[model samples]
Target: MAPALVAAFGGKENITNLDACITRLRVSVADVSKVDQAGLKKLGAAGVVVAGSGVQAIFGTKSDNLKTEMDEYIRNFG
Candidate 1:
């Protein structure tokens, strides 16, 4: 899951931040154009929303744990 999400963002360098709140996964990407909304939906995201340079994906309560994994994955690349 982390791999797919990371790839969709065009790599960990593109992901500046990752956070979550209850049902949404908030992602800050260096390049918003790299975001793949269709791919995210294919990966089981309930929905994908774009706002400025950030993206919010609905993943229900699982977002928190996914955020943790994503953060660690990004750090591994850093």
Candidate 2:
């Protein structure tokens, strides 16, 4: 979740936003520091992994919820 995004872009400054594809969520941050890996884990996500410049979180049964939750998170968090 949040932590995964943080970990993936933690060192970059060109990240401008976040989006996801199927099982992977892509986050763009002005500065990757805005990525919050540890916070995602605290929410009970299965796990988070770094791929290229994006972060992937294992939702397990929550896979279906990813899109829904992502939308909600952005709507609310943003």
Candidate 3:
């Protein structure tokens, strides 16, 4: 899951930040075009938003835990 998410977010190098709130996963990427909205939706993302270098994915309450899992995955083996 992390690998897929990371890839959709443009990989480890592209991701500047990976964070989350109760219902959203907030991110910063070097290239916004690298973000794959359809891929994210396939992975259960409710929606997505892009602005400048920032991208946020809506994932409901699971976003908090999803952030932790993704961060660890990216850190260890992105």
Candidate 4:
């Protein structure tokens, strides 16, 4: 799930930052156009919102864990 989320944000190389609230994962990406809203939707995201370089993915209770996994992915991102 995290991997799919990462991919939706345009992969590890495209991710610039990761953050989360109680019900959503917030991400900053290098290129907004790279975002895959359809993929995120298919991955069970209730909605995907983009603003500037930021993206918000609604995942309800799974958001916190998603943030953790995304952070780990960023740590090991090439």
Candidate 2 global lDDT: 0.48
TM-score, every prediction: 0.48, 0.35, 0.49, 0.48
lDDT of each: 0.60, 0.48, 0.61, 0.61
Give the worst 10-residue stretch by lDDT in candidate 3: 6-15
* Whole-model alpha-carbon lDDT for candidate 1: 0.60
- Point out where model 2 deviates above 4 Å: 1-20, 25-35, 41-46, 50-56
At residue 12, candidate 1 shows an lDDT of 48
- Candidate 1 residue lDDT tens string, 1-78: 555664665344446776755666556665655456666643535566777767776766555555566677668778
Q: What are the runs in model 4 whose C-alpha is more than 4 Å off?
A: 1-6, 10-14, 42-44, 61-78
Supply candidate 3's per-residue lDDT for 20: 58
RMSD in angstroms between candidate 4 and the native structure over all alpha carbons: 5.8
* Best of the two (2, 4) by TM-score: 4
Taking the tens digit of each residue's C-alpha lDDT, what string does model 4 give over 1-78? 546665756455546786755666666665655556666643535566777757676866565555566677667664
| lDDT per residue as tens, model 2, 1-78 | 442343344324355655544554544333434455555532424456655555555545566554455466556666
Per-model RMSD to reference:
5.7, 6.5, 5.2, 5.8
Q: Which stretches of candidate 1 lie over 4 Å from their true place?
A: 1-6, 10-14, 21-23, 42-44, 61-78
